[PDB]
Amino acid sequence: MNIFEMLRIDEGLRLKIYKDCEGYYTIGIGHLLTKSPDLNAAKSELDKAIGRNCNGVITKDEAEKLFNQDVDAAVRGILRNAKLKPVYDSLDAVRRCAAINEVFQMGVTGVAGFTNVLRMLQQKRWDEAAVNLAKSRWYNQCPDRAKRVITTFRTGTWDAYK
Ligand SMILES: [Cl-]
Ligand SMILES: [Cl-]
Ligand SMILES: [Mg+2]
Secondary structure, eight states, X not given: OOHHHHHHHHHOOEEEEEEOTTSOEEEETTEEEESOSOHHHHHHHHHHHHXXXXXXXXXXXXXXXXXXXXXXXHHHHHHTOTTXXXXXXXXXXXXXXXXXHHHHHHOHHHHHTOHHHHHHHHTTOHHHHHHHXXXXXXXXXXXXXXXXXXXXXXXXXXXXXX
């Protein structure tokens, strides 16, 4: 198990445009196309992301390429955010993977907004942090994509992905 396998389980892999649990246009392994309500803007963003005329469809290799880019962007996003970086750096290896997953799913801005959860994690208040995350809109609207991440923050092991 590793962060790639983890996110492949939570997000799955789809090769045409869909709405994610937040309601935004998405493809491949959780790749956010736009927050625009407009399907044309998503279709143009898919072509822009890939470098060719896709007409809403991609290959498995193109998805895996987008996926590497997106996990690298989530890690860089955490490190470059003043609120997230110290918290992240205080986490053990497995909880770091839950942190990357959360950012990959929700984005930096969304995660950074949860000031109290970040303090709970930095202070190693795993049960409280998990209770609080299970009360977010993310959990309530994305319970199948979020449940295992929250448990991972609670326990610090890979067991929810077994
Ligand atoms: Cl560790
Ligand atoms: Cl879900
Ligand atoms: Mg690291």
